Design a protein around this ligand. Structure first.
Ligand code: HEM
Ligand code: HEM
Ligand SMILES: CCCCCCCCO[C@@H]1O[C@H](CO)[C@@H](O)[C@H](O)[C@H]1O
Ligand SMILES: CCCCCCCCO[C@@H]1O[C@H](CO)[C@@H](O)[C@H](O)[C@H]1O
Ligand SMILES: C[C@H](O)[C@H](O)[C@H]1CNc2nc(N)[nH]c(=O)c2N1
Ligand SMILES: C[C@H](O)[C@H](O)[C@H]1CNc2nc(N)[nH]c(=O)c2N1
Lengths: 412, 412
């Protein structure tokens, strides 16, 4: 009938019935069930048609007051389109609905309470890399909005036969470079070494800085990828300052204000969109905890420890807990001072609890990946830690993709 | 062939081959796959015999130098025993091996590096509740060891037909009571209200204190449960003090030094042990984060906030992070000062990483439940957060059980 969900915090019980519409490996980052690979032939008509019917029904069933004539007309028009062309085109309104629903169906997203507030940029008419670059620049500019961040998504042309895919080779729109120095040390974001090297190989000019924004590596209509530098006037950054420790700014840190996922695939009604970058606004712990404190990233934890005068040689002193918290305070304080939208993890978790609650009333479910929803620091202090969650893959949905460099056939 | 495991911290790769010997719901606390319920008929001989053979082979295969004659003799002797009695008895040495292996196969345990260091108390000859009480007292006394905590387990008689089960009704050996006061407020451990009431119903005398140790509710040979008070001289406690904030002790807090799970079932070679309490030593965050900071427990977070002079009215101030850390420092400092064994979560996580590493070399696997292994605070700061893990149920194994009060048929 349904699955029982319990909130060990408030003792509340939820009944999950939404999992029935889904299509021990838990701590796997990129599992196959969350990936949607490439193809070299169109989507079989016997598979496409049913999925399209399902979607058209979902879309029309969401209206406050049903419009049956249009519903039938659309189902019929879509079928005829599939019969005559082997694929079909979504109406702008259907695309909008799809992007929000896909967001809404993202197990790993904690900001889903904002699901209905999303700007959609229709770039399905695109043809060249230069044109992709232009759309991406518009997106970056729109979303940044002088610090008052706005969530948006740019939808490029859908996969046709699978040989003319549009793909952003970057993981995010804005991301810093990582360089292996001559003296053996690493500079910048150590996690981007191979990709930085890739850009260098394609002609990009390395500036060997600590915070050099990487170029957009665009691939359009199956063509080989072209490199484009992001116009510095478009990249808004925040200078890190601590509200008490003046020595903090001496660390010379900063971070970009725009969190935008660039390499995911949007699946809707049998249609696949290999290129559709999107963004929301940052949750403080992503920068404060992941970017700055991961040993495989900027790794600033120990230096902030010494600066604070902590006993960085005794783990039981809980110095790491003391440091990470100050770094997080610096991040939040800095964004707040530069008037750049940002949300702390505590407020974020509460917001999601409200969302999950709204979702179960509205449709009897909310796909949730606990491992991703629980913040990287102070987990049990947040309500999300005490919430039992079901993790299933609905549709529409945003899937991961096999890295483009691993399956791309180079022409020149 | 095997499953690939990746450590996103060091980039290392492990090959899991151990999962083949196993018998999306992830964030479920007490799933059926981890529970072993009651029965009213013996274990079918066609099921028992194979499991027994498997175990005897495992046990004999673990010796540095195989002793084949004994191996054959044992297999044969065990079969004859099963044929003639319908069950069988493990040798003390086999029991020891079973308890350690079960520990070793506990997905949710972070202290598994200590797996081979375990004291085993053989109480399989027990008959009455008074006798269980005596064994439990010996265990508590042995394990506490004046603060220098020792890991131990007391094994009571195995399930025969399922109608003469030995069961400790408590979740832990030492645990504080929770009382609903006349003025509506809760006193003590709010999580133990029903159980405290149960004890009261069975004759126990409520002292309405904040830290009253609950009585042992023992059930022996299927008989109705008898209540027994734990001798105060046996319960070692630690008074909470902060190394800087003198107002900390004014909070009048303390906690027991002995973490002992009392209600789990030990499964080995087809045999089931419904009563086998065990203990290790505390990991600081269990008390500092779970006991003191859970809203459904002692809920001291806000008071510690005000005392610190923090802005407890603004979540973005990260006051909760500041508080919880001081509480954790108080806990660790207090145990260290009273000479009571304890391990901080940072050291704990490192220790487990070493264990997991040792396990993959030794047997190509280590069952791990990420959701439980990652500490309640500062997750990504610990190496465990960046480790991909496989969660499977091997054998021997410690299972959960349906609450005794839910399936017990009362006699008087
Ligand atoms: C408005 C503010 C938003 C906030 C604060 C938020 C926050 C987050 C966070 C904290 C993550 C985890 C990132 C990581 O650790 O890798 C995430 C993941 C994700 N978000 Fe959101 N989000 C927001 C908006 C959006 C929007 C607008 C979309 C898409 C239309 C979305 C789609 C996703 C998806 C698909 C993931 C999974 C990405 C992955 O698995 O790597 N989110 N989000
Ligand atoms: C020597 C020190 C040890 C440490 C520091 C340690 C620590 C822990 C911790 C932190 C948990 C999670 C508790 C919770 O949040 O519910 C746990 C669970 C567990 N431990 Fe260990 N442990 C130790 C020894 C042992 C021993 C001696 C055994 C058994 C022979 C064992 C068996 C288990 C089992 C079965 C669980 C799962 C309990 C549950 O799911 O509620 N551990 N341990
Ligand atoms: C073979 C394909 C058959 C498709 C049958 C579609 C029937 C119409 O479907 C209906 O649409 C309404 C909105 O217009 C919704 O409110 C109803 O819940 C839904 O059942
Ligand atoms: C029907 C039951 C058949 C059981 C066959 C058991 C064969 C013995 O089993 C052997 O025992 C040795 C230790 O003595 C181990 O070292 C070997 O790996 C193991 O194969
Ligand atoms: C191995 C594990 O899946 C990995 O470390 C995870 C854990 N939880 C996460 N949670 C979020 N939000 N983001 C992440 O990248 C990760 N990574
Ligand atoms: C719902 C979720 O399973 C529950 O809150 C968990 C999370 N992780 C945990 N981890 C540990 N170690 N102990 C716990 O009790 C829990 N409880």
């Amino acid at each position: 009938q349904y699955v029982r969900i319990k909130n060990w915090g408030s003792g509340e019980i939820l009944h999950d019935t939404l999992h029935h519409k889904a299509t021990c490996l838990g701590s796997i980052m990129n599992p196959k069930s969350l990936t949607r690979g490439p193809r070299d032939k169109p989507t079989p008509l016997e598979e496409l048609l049913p999925h399209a019917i399902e979607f058209i029904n979902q879309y029309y069933g969401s209206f406050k007051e049903a419009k049956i004539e249009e519903h039938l007309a659309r189902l019929e028009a879509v079928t005829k389109e599939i019969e005559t062309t082997g694929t079909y085109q979504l109406t702008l309104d259907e695309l909008i609905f799809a992007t929000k629903m896909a967001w809404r169906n993202a197990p790993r997203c904690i900001g889903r309470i904002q699901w209905s507030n999303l700007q959609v940029f229709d770039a399905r008419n695109c043809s060249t890399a230069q044109e992709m670059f232009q759309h991406i620049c518009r997106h970056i500019l729109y979303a940044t909005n002088n610090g008052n961040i706005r969530s948006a998504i740019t939808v490029f042309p859908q996969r046709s036969d699978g040989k003319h895919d549009f793909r952003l080779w970057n993981s995010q729109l804005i991301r810093y470079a990582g360089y292996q120095m001559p003296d053996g040390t690493i500079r910048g974001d150590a996690a981007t070494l191979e990709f930085t090297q890739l850009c260098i190989d394609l002609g990009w000019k390395p500036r060997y800085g600590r915070f050099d924004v990487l170029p957009l590596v665009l691939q359009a209509d199956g063509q080989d990828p072209e490199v484009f530098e992001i116009p510095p006037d478009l990249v808004l950054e925040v200078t890190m300052e601590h509200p008490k420790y003046e020595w903090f700014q001496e660390l010379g840190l900063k971070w970009y204000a725009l969190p935008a996922v660039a390499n995911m695939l949007l699946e809707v009604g049998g249609l696949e969109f290999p290129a559709c970058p999107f963004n929301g606004w940052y949750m403080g712990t992503e920068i404060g905890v992941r970017d700055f404190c991961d040993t495989q990233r900027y790794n600033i934890l120990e230096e902030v420890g010494r600066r604070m005068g902590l006993e960085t040689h005794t783990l039981a002193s809980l110095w790491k807990d003391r440091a990470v918290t100050e770094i997080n305070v610096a991040v939040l304080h800095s964004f707040q001072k530069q008037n750049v939208t940002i949300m702390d993890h505590h407020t974020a978790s509460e917001s999601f609890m409200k969302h999950m609650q709204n979702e179960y009333r509205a449709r009897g479910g909310c796909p949730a990946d606990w491992i991703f929803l629980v913040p990287p620091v102070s987990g049990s202090i947040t309500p999300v830690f005490h919430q039992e969650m079901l993790n299933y893959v609905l549709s529409p949905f945003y899937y991961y993709q096999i890295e483009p460099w691993k399956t791309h056939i180079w022409q020149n």
